Symmetry: C3
Subunit: 154 residues, 3 copies
């Protein structure tokens, strides 16, 4: 009986694993995930960049990053309002990098941006990035609060 | 070795438990749950209060209860139509109580309400409570059908 | 030792089964599944009929099928755009059948449809069906791309 029960629990475990995989697949689908496309999700809450990174990390995803015009539009649509992007120049001023490492391969900066502005009064300049009107990018204070949009693999 | 096999399966189970918790957190996030805020959800189905309590309990949740003006607005936005609240004066006419216990702390009654109206000729007065698109409360018959909105802990 | 651990593992597995069922129930509820009604879900992606079938099947559901005017309205509500239905006459031209088997009963064809049109130039006639804007049906090429909408049991 002991070995028979053990073999059954292995089957129970494998069955639950496939069932949870199905649950995740269905959830992604109902939330709009498209075939061969990473999917962006948000709870529409505004918060400082540090909280956005922690929260997406907690969800096993990353802070949304547009790699091309298409993805930039996808993120804009999900957010509906201004959201943070996983891009910053905290490591080297003026040199924007993906929070997930590397130099930029695509950008959609607003005219006269990035300008590492200090006038906001929160302290320091501007090392974070958010997507504003018309999907254009603006460098903004990481201390500022904007929409949290997380990314999951295609 | 059965002991090793058993240890290995315990580990597999712990991983599934972690993945399921992740699934639950992502679902809430994708549905708009705010940090430190309660999670209100609805299927937009109107039904008698009895139905709503049973439904929310089945989901291990409870009928939505606004504890302040903020939450009242949040519930209003999710329901988008008239929704029952987890408040009734069924036990003792005149003394409204939370379905989860205790005397009302916050309220937002409409003018001329509660009137424990009997004119609905549906049987008895009005011992339940529902919200209107305006956000104000009105006592209504528990036998009437209104939107089901369940809440989950912050 | 061994037998006690096995008993606890059985218990751990059952609580996991229980929690997963609850996750599935909550997901459906939050997506709008009405009591005693089947529930329709879509990711708003357009794709050839064979892909829609494959996808719904992967999710343990089937391509949406309107069995009456109410369900037809429900499906158009969910689709928001032209979507394929689980109905075709691929087996025997002129005799529409449900993908899950059986001859078509309730129908809601647009005037002058079905017409097994060839002029589309995709090759062959029209053996699939899609619901357009207004809820009416049209036979269309199974090779054309339309919104994927899956249904799950009441
Ligand atoms: C939301 C936004 O774009 N803020 C920018 C700020 O980052 C800075 O560039 C400033 C320059 O004066 O202009 C503002 O409009
Ligand atoms: C939706 C609503 O407000 N219903 C109320 C009803 O509860 C009762 O108070 C009645 C007075 O006869 O007035 C109605 O307007
Ligand atoms: C979308 C739609 O209704 N397409 C139809 C097509 O199926 C075929 O019937 C054709 C014949 O003139 O008319 C088109 O309007
Ligand atoms: Ca079993
Ligand atoms: Ca900077
Ligand atoms: Ca700037
Ligand atoms: Ca009473
Ligand atoms: Ca009363
Ligand atoms: Ca009243
Ligand atoms: Ca335990
Ligand atoms: Ca045909
Ligand atoms: Ca046609
Ligand atoms: Cl900064
Ligand atoms: Cl009553
Ligand atoms: Cl065809
Ligand atoms: Na979900």
């Amino acid at each position: 009986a002991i070995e028979v029960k053990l073999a059954n629990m292995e089957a129970e475990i494998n069955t639950l694993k496939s069932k949870l995989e199905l649950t995740n697949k269905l959830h992604a689908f109902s939330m709009g995930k498209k075939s061969g496309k990473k999917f962006f999700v948000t709870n529409h809450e505004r918060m400082p960049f540090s909280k956005v990174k922690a929260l997406c990390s907690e969800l096993r995803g990353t802070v949304a990053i547009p790699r091309n015009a298409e993805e930039n539009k996808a993120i804009q649509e999900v957010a509906k309002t201004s959201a943070f992007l996983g891009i910053t120049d905290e490591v080297t001023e003026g040199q924007f990098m993906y929070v997930t490492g590397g130099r930029l391969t695509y950008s959609n900066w607003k005219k006269d941006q990035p300008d590492d502005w200090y006038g906001h009064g929160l302290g320091g300049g501007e090392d974070c990035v958010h997507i504003v009107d018309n999907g254009l990018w603006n460098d903004i204070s990481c201390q500022a609060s904007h929409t949290a949009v997380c990314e999951f693999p295609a």
